[PDB]
Each structure stands twice: as structure tokens, then as C-alpha cells.
Specification:
The structure is cut from a larger assembly and holds 1 copy of chain A, 1 copy of chain B, 2 copies of chain C, 1 copy of chain E and 1 copy of chain F. By secondary structure, chain A is mostly helical. Chain A contains 11 helices and no strands. Chain A starts with 7 loop residues before the first helix and ends in an 18-residue tail after the last helix. Chain C is built from 3 helices and no strands. By secondary structure, chain E is mainly α. Classes of the chains: A mainly alpha, B mainly beta, C mainly alpha, E mainly alpha, F mainly alpha. Chains in contact: A-E, B-D, B-E, C-E, D-E, E-F. Chain B: Belongs to the WD repeat SEC13 family.
Chain lengths: ~220, ~290, ~80, ~30, ~325, ~150
């Protein structure tokens, strides 16, 4: 109903999608991002809403150019400070909602899931991989890793992902072992561990890959 | 002095020359990547509007034409081809390709709108070609052979005052002025002062002045100022501006106040303005 | 006098518009005979020129056909109101 | 970035007269 | 009946107009699969009728069918051609996939192109791009992707690949046993490129870029063609993925070509005139070499290259003096 | 040897000879291929073309036309044979008793338009006349169908 490909009702709705896009106040940015999270359910409703964000930045504060540029700016700014503008609580809740909406679009629809990964203009794949090698707060590491899974659902990206998690040595085969013992074990909450298993379970489901890394280690998936 | 929008050219090599349009809304740019790019800089926003690739070698110079004839842009090149682009309904297409030269075409300069749509092409074969669009039909070509012994580096037309005249500088150490007499381009003057290759000559757009001024930069570094009080007399007097240690490349006059911009091999731009008494004085030093 | 091609296209368009207006007015204003004769002469001249319209673009063709049709209708009306 | 300061080999071949113009392309004056 | 009557009366223009009206009204009201097919048929008929115009009377005065400001869309054949191309691409996509079928049902040209490339119907995407003057970059990139996939892929992928090649058009039959499906797809792409070619920089660029998705040793024929056309671009892509040794080999070969040895393979014409040397690239290469400074072999090759270049330059200077004297 | 490549080659040479002479050689050998025809796509085309030839000659015009349209739609034929098949379809439409149905002629129209696009990416005059006559006949048949 929210997507218009006209009955007076359809015009008053498609207007309501566009008439509400006018507001730019920071107070309605979080909910309007949650609204689109609801509207992007069902594959067709994902691609169309993926195309709406694409054109809105071809500047409107919600767009594919702003989302992927805002993450790239935080890559350079958080890397230039390696041996701190900790992403403000509003820029954090702004980024989580922009990643929670992206996860709901690419899960329901795979066409977007194919189109959003192989992309070269924004190049999210290794830019995410280069973002994990700069040590960050654990919440951003997890959402980065999670989006890697929904991107890896596609088989060809899954095969490309299993050869990358091997070269990056995210798990040391300094990493998830220390965060589980020092941070999650102190908070008595384990949201990072549940998510790292859910990523492995998807990549194994696509394939139990051939020997993960020769030369570096003795071949195999055993250390994981 | 003040800093406005800084453009991102998305280029791959050294931009050899640039040139803005009549109204200052666009900027053409040419590089050694065989590509002439058009930029729409309006209200501080860098927008690449067109990318024109038709050359086989490096592009040396780009020149915009007068508004009345449309958006005509000339681009000379190493591949002996002078390509004239034209914008129709927002689309840039090649309308004419003059291939009548034996070596690299180094400079293109349009004539004042009063004369017509004339374009002069100076090439390293020592020849200057005058292309003329009569409105209907193709381009009439008048080639001045053996203009310079070694090669021609730069051409520039005189402000309309109508006797069609243009000045050309070559590697033969001589700055030559040309004049159209009886429909034929004939050599008018031979100005000799340089001890080496003339790199660029530009005729001042004299405003409200009986005198005609031409500037010439050279390989040795000596920038000379050529002045003729009476056009009839054709007696040109040179005046040394400053001997730069590094090779001076090109010279450019300001449209409104006649301020010469000189660039040397020292990667710096020195602005020179003549005082009331007559002595030339540098007003600012804008280095890269 | 100075405008080139003035006679051709200019006269054509002017004639078209004037003919429409005059036809309408005269029909309503007791059909004055002298004005009717003038209209006849003008419409004959206009036919003579419509055939000579040169075509460089597609719009030229469409406009030409439209004008021809309208002038033929007007010519028929004029014959009807004069001879019969 | 444009090379900081290579001014010897390319300068000797910059004084060459076979194609001083091509060797003097690096220049600019708009 | 109306349609038949008009076409019997040779009123090609009128028949076309009636069919256009037909199609519009059709769609507007009936949006079922059958109704949509009928609209397509109607547009096809309209196009065909308009094209029957007499050669003598090569003019079709067509007005906008405002009544499904009375506009007059003088479309000649161009615009209706575009509409029907769009409809046919919608139809072809519908057959391959059902959801994208519905999506084409209500979309635009760029959207059609996108979905076709995803599904793997490349030749159709190529044709659509040409009609709306859209560039062929997308299709070339998609083809390159499939080729890279097959280069290192499973058996099932190989068979599906063979299949979609038959959907496209392989020019000739080659008996080579070693070729397999992958090599057949390579040749298809190559042929499509040669026929539907435009700006060279664009197509070669996109192919090479996509090939280097995860690295690939380029074949010698391609290397030679590129060297003969755009050696500078060939060098830039090397530095993009850090292939310094290959870059140095290319530089040495270019130097040899500029000296007359195998100049044909580099597009060097040479009365000396052309001597364009990419100095900036050499500079960047030297900078990349002088960062890690660990491999002794790299340092040695750098030194060799530098010595050879110095020799080249002295010879160039001698030739220079000679030619200057000659002209004078 | 059950080789698809050599069979294709041989079938191609046969078609070339036919075009030049105007008549097929060794007609009998071509009629009884049977299941050997499925070895190559080009061989398959040859057999079906010869069958059409036989059919329309001995008053089986309807079946022949159907076979021709089938061949054209399957794209087995090379592009030069496409035009010949269309020329044959022309007198089939022309005959007083309508052979091709409306939908079949629409499919032929689509093929002709698709051929025109691919072609771009005397003879012409005859083919345009052919196109026009085709259209006229198709339209008359369509009228008769809308009628019936």
C-alpha cells in the first residue's frame, strides 16, 4: 500500500509518503527511520524502498550516498586516531537505525542483496573489512559482522566471504576471545557471542569451505 | 586573495591549461590523459557536465568562443587534430575535425566576435591555419605556410579596432604580427628581442587606450612588453619586465584592468601592474 | 521592404489569420459584398502560396497540412455564400 | 601528487630541442 | 472491427492511432495477465501499421491521443519504437522470472536493464541500452562478472553457463575439447564487444576493472591489444592492485617500442615527432618501491630499470641534437 | 561417431548448395534421417526444411506453413534462411484460402521486427513490398476472425 507503481485514495497515500519526507527536524529522524523499517517488509517493498533511498541522494538526509559516506567518514576519522569523537549518542542511534533498516531490506529481498554487495561505487564489502581491522567499540564490530552475514546469504558472496574471514584472521587462528572474557562476561550479557555463531552458521550452511588457509596454518576449518 | 570553492577534477594527469567562459559559469580543462573535461561551477558547486575524448595524444590548449555563436569550444592537440565541439541541447558532439597539419597543434585562439567565427591554429610545423565558418556550409581553411622556421607556439588576436590582425610567437626567437590585406594574411611586423624560444604571446585587450600592448614570455625568462602608441606607425617598443631564472610558460592579461599574470617554472604566479609613471611593479605572488 | 522572405511566410500567416477573422465577422455583419470579394481574392492568393511552403522539419509538414485543410473549408464556405 | 623535485635528468632532456615542447608539457598558465 | 476497417482503408495513420488508444485504455482498465498481453499485441500492431507508410509519402503526421491541450507528438518511428522495445523487454523478463515479471509490468527502462542483467539475459540488456541511448557499461560489467565466476567455479555453474550461451548467440562452432562452457562464454563476450563497440576507454576499462575483482592474470593477446591502444591506462590499473613487476616489464617494452623495436605492438608511429612518456606513472612506481624496501630482488630490478632508462635518455639527447641540426 | 560438430558442418554445406542450385540434392537421403537428425541443430533444420518442401508441393500447405513458423520461432535457422522462410510464408498468406491464423501472422511480424533490429546491429525493395502484402493479408484474416 505504501508503494505506488490513480484512485483518489492512492494519490492521498503516495502523497503521504512524499508529504512526510519534507520534515527534516532531528526529532523525527529516528521514527521516520523506524517507519521505513516497517515499510520495507516483503521483497518487492524492499527493492522499491531501496530505490527510494537511492534517488533521494542522487541533499535529503536519508539516502544511500549519505549512509555509505557517513560510514566512510567514520572510518577515516576513527582510523586517523590509531596509535576521540566517540560517535555521539545521537549519531550512534542514527547509525544503528540505518543499519537495522538495511538489514530488513536485504533479508526480505535478495535482488537488493545481490545488488548491494557487488556494488563498486560505495564498495561496502572490504570497506567493512577495513573497518574491523581498526579496533572499534564492540557494538559497531557486531553490526558490521552481522551485515556481513545478510550479505553472505547469497552463495557467491558466501564463498567470497569464507576466503576473506580467513585472510583477515578476525578470530586468531586480540579479538572476540578477549571481548567475551572481559566485556561480555562482566556485563553478564552475551549479545556478541550469539551473533558470531549466527554468522558462522550461515556461512557453513552455504558451504563447509575447502581448506581455510594454506601456508599460514595447517589447512582446514578446525581452529574455528 | 579570498578562497572560493575548490574543484575536484577527477583527473589522472597534469592539467596543462584551463579557461573559463564569457560569463564565468563554466570551466574547461585539458590534461595529458587525452581528455577535455567541462565543469559547471555555479554558486560554489563543482559539477562535471561533460567528458570529451577524441584525441590520440595530449591536449595542450582549450578556448571558449563568444556566446552569440553558441557554446563553441575548441581544443588543439598532439595528434595534429583540431577538434571543434559544440553543445546542442545539453549534449556535446564533435562538429568539425581539421586534420591538416604535419605536427602537434599547440594553440587555439578565437577571433573577436566582430570579425566573425574565425579560429587560428598554431602548430609545430611552422604553420598557422585560419578556419572560418560562414554560417552555411563547411569551414574555409587559409593556411599560412612557413610562418616560423622551427615551429609556432602561441597565437592571439588583436582587440577589434575593422582590420583583422593577430600576433604569433615561435621557436625561431621572433614575435611576428600578421595582418589580413586584400583577403590574404600577410606578415606585418618582426619584433626581435628574445635570445631564445618564445613560449607564449598574448595581445592585451586594450580598453579606452590609444596604445596597443603585447606581452611575450620566453625560454630564457625575460618577459618583454611591446607597445605601439600609434597603430599606423607600427613602431613597437620593448620593455623588460623581469628576468625570471626559470622558464616562463604563458602570459595572460586581465580583461578589465590590464594586469599581467606571469607563470614561471618555479611553480609561482606573479602579478604585474604598470604604474602611472610607467614602471612595472609586482603586486602579489600567488605560488602553487 | 527590408525583411527577407518577408513576402512569402509573413504574407502566408497574416493572410490565414485575417481570413479567419474576416470570414467570421462578415458572415455576422450582413455579409458585405465588397469585403466578400476581397476575401475571395485573398483566399485564392493563399491557396497559391500554401503549395509553395518549403519543408525542412516535420512541424512544417503538419502545419502546412492543417492550413491547407482550413483554407479549403473556408474556400468552400465562401463559394457557397457567393455563387449560390 | 606531482613529484616533489626531480630536476636533473629530466632537466638535461628538458634542454633537448627534438621535442622541448613535449618535455615542457608539465607547464601551466591559465 | 474498427481496427480492421481502418487498415482495409489503408489509413495506416488512423489504424496506428486506434491501436495506440486501444493499448492505453486496455492497460488502464484491465491489469490481468491476459489484458496485459493484449496491450502488447495492440502496440505491436500499431507500430507495424505506422511503418507501412508509403515510401513516396515518407511522412506520418501523428497526433497525441490525448483522448484515451491536444498535443501533437510527431514521433515518426523513434518514440513508438522505444515504447515497444520497453514492452518487449518487460515481456522477456516476465518469462525468465515471475516476480521480476510483475516488477517489469510496472517500471521503467533502467529498472528493466537492472533486472535483466541480474537474471543473466545479457544480449537483451545490450539491445535495450542501445535504443534509449543508455551506455553499454552495465552489460559489459555483468558479462565480466560471469566470466570471473566461471574462472574459479563449480560444475553446476559451468552447465548453467553453457545454457545461457545458447540463449545468446555464439558466432561459430569450435571443436576444441579443452574449451568447455567457460571459454565459450568468454568468446561470446568478446564478439558482443567487437560488434557493439563505442568509446574504447569505457568498455576495456570496465572489463579490466571487473576482471580484477579478486585478481587475474590477463592473457597475452588482450595485453598486446591494450598496449597498442592505451598503454597509460594499462599502467594505471597495475598500480591499482600493486603489480609493480608487470608494470616495470610494460615500461621496458614501451621504451623498446619508442626506440623502434616492435613499435607496432604499442601503436607508436615512429622525422622524429612522437615521444610521449608517462613520467608520473614512473614516479608513482618508484615511490611504491621505496616504501617497504625489504626485497633485495625488487631493489635490483629497480636499479636495472633506472640504468636502462638513463641509457635511453642519453641516446634520446644525441638523436635530438642530430635532428635539430638537420632541420636547421 | 555421433559427432555433433562434423554433422553441423556437413548440414551447412548442403544448405549452401541448395541456395545456389535452387534444388536439394540427394532428396531421399535427407528424408529418412529419422533420429540421426537430432545429432546436430543444423542437421535438424535441414530435415524439417526438406519436409516442408515435400509437404507444400503435394498439397499440404497448412502443415508446411505450421512447420515453417515453428522453425523460425525456435531460432534454429541461421539468419539468411530467415528471409527465405518469410518469402515462402508470403504466398501462403496470399492464397485465397487463408492458411496462417491471426496469431501466427503476429508471431511472424514479431520475428520480422526482431530480425530488423538484429540486422542493424532491389532486395530491400522486394522485402518491403513483401512486408506490406503480408500486413494486408494478415489484417484481412484478422478481420475475418473478428468476423467469425
Amino acid at each position: 500500500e505504501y508503494w505506488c507503481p490513480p484512485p483518489q485514495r492512492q494519490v492521498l497515500l503516495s502523497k503521504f509518503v512524499r508529504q512526510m519526507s519534507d520534515l527534516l527536524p532531528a526529532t523525527l529522524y529516528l521514527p521516520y527511520l523506524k517507519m521505513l523499517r516497517g515499510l520495507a517488509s516483503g521483497p518487492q517493498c524492499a527493492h522499491y524502498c531501496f530505490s527510494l533511498l537511492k534517488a533521494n541522494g542522487g541533499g535529503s538526509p536519508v539516502s544511500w550516498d549519505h549512509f555509505f559516506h557517513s560510514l566512510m567518514l567514520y572510518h577515516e576519522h576513527l582510523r586517523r586516531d590509531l596509535p576521540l569523537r566517540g560517535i555521539t549518542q545521537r549519531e550512534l542511534d542514527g547509525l544503528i537505525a540505518c543499519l537495522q533498516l538495511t538489514c530488513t531490506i536485504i533479508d526480505w529481498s535478495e535482488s537488493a542483496r545481490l545488488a548491494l554487495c557487488e556494488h563498486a561505487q560505495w564498495m561496502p564489502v572490504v570497506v567493512i573489512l577495513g573497518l574491523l581491522q581498526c579496533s572499534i567499540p564492540p557494538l559497531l564490530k557486531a553490526e558490521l559482522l552481522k551485515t556481513l552475514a545478510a550479505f553472505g546469504k547469497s552463495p557467491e558472496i558466501a564463498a567470497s566471504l569464507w576466503q576473506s574471514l580467513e585472510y583477515t584472521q578476525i578470530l586468531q587462528t586480540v579479538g572476540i576471545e578477549v571481548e567475551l572474557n572481559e566485556i561480555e562476561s562482566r556485563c553478564e550479557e552475551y549479545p556478541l557471542t550469539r551473533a558470531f555463531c549466527q554468522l558462522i552458521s550461515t556461512l557453513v550452511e552455504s558451504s563447509f569451505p575447502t581448506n581455510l588457509g594454506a601456508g599460514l596454518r595447517a589447512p582446514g576449518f578446525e581452529p574455528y | 586573495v579570498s578562497v572560493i570553492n575548490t574543484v575536484d577534477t577527477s583527473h589522472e594527469d597534469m592539467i596543462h591549461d584551463a579557461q573559463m567562459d564569457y560569463y564565468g559559469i563554466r570551466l574547461a580543462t585539458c590534461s595529458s590523459d587525452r581528455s577535455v573535461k567541462i565543469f559547471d561551477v555555479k554558486n560554489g558547486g563543482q559539477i562535471l557536465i561533460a567528458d570529451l575524448r577524441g584525441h590520440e595524444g595530449p591536449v595542450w590548449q582549450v578556448a571558449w568562443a563568444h556566446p552569440m555563436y553558441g557554446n563553441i569550444l575548441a581544443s588543439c592537440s598532439y595528434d595534429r587534430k583540431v577538434i571543434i565541439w559544440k553543445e546542442e541541447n545539453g549534449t556535446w558532439e564533435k562538429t568539425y575535425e581539421y586534420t591538416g597539419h604535419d605536427s602537434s597543434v599547440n594553440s587555439v585562439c578565437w577571433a573577436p566576435h566582430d570579425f566573425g567565427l574565425l579560429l587560428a591554429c598554431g602548430s609545430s610545423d611552422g604553420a598557422i591555419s585560419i578556419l572560418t565558418y560562414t554560417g552555411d556550409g563547411p569551414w574555409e581553411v587559409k593556411k599560412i605556410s612557413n610562418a616560423h622556421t622551427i615551429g609556432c607556439n602561441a597565437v592571439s588576436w588583436a582587440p577589434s579596432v575593422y582590420i583583422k590582425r593577430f600576433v604569433s610567437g615561435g621557436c625561431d626567437n621572433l614575435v611576428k604580427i600578421w595582418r589580413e590585406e586584400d583577403g590574404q594574411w600577410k606578415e606585418d611586423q618582426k619584433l626581435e628581442a628574445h635570445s631564445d624560444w618564445v613560449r607564449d604571446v598574448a595581445w592585451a585587450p586594450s580598453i579606452g587606450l590609444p596604445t596597443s600592448t603585447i606581452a611575450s614570455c620566453s625560454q630564457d625568462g625575460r618577459v618583454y612588453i611591446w607597445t605601439s602608441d600609434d597603430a599606423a606607425t607600427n613602431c613597437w617598443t620593448p620593455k623588460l619586465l623581469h628576468k625570471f631564472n626559470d622558464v616562463v610558460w604563458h602570459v595572460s592579461w586581465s580583461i578589465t584592468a590590464n594586469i599581467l599574470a606571469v607563470s614561471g617554472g618555479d611553480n609561482k604566479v606573479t602579478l604585474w601592474k604598470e604604474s602611472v609613471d610607467g614602471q612595472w611593479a609586482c603586486i602579489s605572488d600567488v605560488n602553487k | 521592404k527590408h525583411i527577407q522572405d518577408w513576402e512569402t511566410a509573413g504574407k502566408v500567416y497574416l493572410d490565414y489569420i485575417r481570413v479567419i477573422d474576416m470570414l467570421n465577422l462578415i458572415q455576422q455583419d450582413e455579409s458585405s459584398g465588397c469585403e466578400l470579394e476581397k476575401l475571395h481574392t485573398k483566399v485564392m492568393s493563399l491557396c497559391k502560396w500554401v503549395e509553395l511552403i518549403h519543408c525542412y522539419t516535420a512541424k512544417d509538414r503538419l502545419a502546412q497540412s492543417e492550413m491547407a485543410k482550413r483554407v479549403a473549408n473556408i474556400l468552400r464556405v465562401v463559394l457557397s455564400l457567393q455563387q449560390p | 601528487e606531482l613529484v616533489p623535485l626531480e630536476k636533473s635528468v629530466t632537466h638535461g632532456r628538458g634542454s633537448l630541442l627534438i621535442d622541448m615542447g613535449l618535455f615542457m608539457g608539465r607547464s601551466f598558465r591559465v | 472491427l474498427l481496427y480492421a476497417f481502418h487498415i482495409y482503408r489503408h489509413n495506416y495513420r488512423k489504424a496506428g492511432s486506434v491501436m495506440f488508444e486501444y493499448g492505453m485504455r486496455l492497460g488502464r482498465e484491465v491489469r490481468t495477465l491476459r489484458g496485459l498481453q493484449k496491450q502488447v499485441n495492440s502496440y505491436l500492431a500499431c507500430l507495424n501499421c505506422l511503418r507501412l507508410i508509403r515510401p513516396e509519402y515518407a511522412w506520418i503526421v501523428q497526433p497525441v491521443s490525448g483522448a484515451v491541450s491536444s498535443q501533437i507528438e510527431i514521433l515518426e518511428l523513434r518514440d513508438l519504437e522505444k515504447e515497444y522495445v520497453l514492452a518487449q523487454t518487460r515481456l522477456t523478463l516476465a518469462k525468465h522470472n515471475p516476480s521480476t515479471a510483475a516488477i517489469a509490468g510496472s517500471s521503467a527502462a533502467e529498472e528493466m536493464v537492472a533486472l535483466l542483467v541480474q537474471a543473466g539475459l545479457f544480449d537483451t540488456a545490450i539491445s535495450l541500452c542501445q535504443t534509449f541511448k543508455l551506455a553499454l557499461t552495465s552489460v559489459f560489467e555483468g558479462l565480466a562478472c560471469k566470466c570471473i565466476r566461471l574462472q574459479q567455479g563449480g560444475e553446476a555453474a559451468q552447465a548453467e553457463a553453457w545454457e545461457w550461451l545458447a540463449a545468446n548467440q555464439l558466432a561459430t562452432v569450435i571443436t576444441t575439447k579443452e574449451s568447455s562452457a567457460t571459454d565459450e562464454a568468454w568468446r561470446l563476450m568478446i564478439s558482443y564487444l567487437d560488434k557493439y563497440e563505442a568509446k574504447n576507454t569505457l568498455y576495456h576499462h570496465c572489463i579490466i576493472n571487473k576482471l580484477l575483482s579478486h585478481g587475474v592474470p590477463l592473457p597475452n593477446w588482450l595485453i598486446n591489444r591494450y598496449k597498442a591502444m592505451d598503454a597509460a591506462e594499462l599502467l594505471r590499473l597495475y598500480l591499482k592492485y600493486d603489480l609493480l613487476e608487470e608494470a616495470a616489464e610494460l615500461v621496458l617494452e614501451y621504451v623498446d617500442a619508442l626506440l623502434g623495436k616492435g613499435h607496432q605492438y604499442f601503436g607508436i608511429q615512429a622525422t622524429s615527432q612522437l615521444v610521449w612518456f608517462p613520467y608520473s606513472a614512473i614516479d608513482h612506481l618508484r615511490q611504491a618501491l621505496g616504501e617497504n624496501e625489504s626485497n633485495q630482488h625488487n631493489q635490483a630490478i629497480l636499479s636495472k630499470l633506472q640504468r636502462k632508462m638513463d641509457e635511453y635518455f642519453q641516446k634520446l639527447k644525441k638523436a635530438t641534437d642530430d635532428y635539430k641540426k638537420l632541420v636547421q | 561417431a555421433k559427432d555433433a560438430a562434423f554433422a553441423t558442418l556437413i548440414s551447412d554445406r548442403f544448405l549452401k548448395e541448395y541456395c545456389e542450385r535452387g534444388n536439394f540434392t540427394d532428396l531421399d537421403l535427407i528424408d529418412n534421417l529419422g533420429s540421426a537428425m537430432l545429432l546436430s541443430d543444423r542437421l535438424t533444420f535441414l530435415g524439417k526444411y526438406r519436409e516442408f518442401h515435400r509437404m507444400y508441393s503435394q498439397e499440404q500447405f497448412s502443415e508446411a506453413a505450421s512447420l515453417l513458423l515453428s522453425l523460425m520461432t525456435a531460432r534454429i535457422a541461421p539468419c539468411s534462411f530467415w528471409l527465405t522462410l518469410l518469402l515462402d510464408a508470403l504466398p501462403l498468406l496470399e492464397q485465397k484460402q487463408v492458411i496462417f491464423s491471426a496469431e501466427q501472422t503476429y508471431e511472424l511480424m514479431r520475428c520480422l521486427e526482431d530480425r530488423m533490429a538484429a540486422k542493424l546491429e532491389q532486395d530491400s525493395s522486394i522485402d518491403n513490398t513483401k512486408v506490406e502484402m503480408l500486413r494486408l493479408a494478415l489484417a484481412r484474416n484478422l478481420a475475418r476472425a473478428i468476423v467469425t
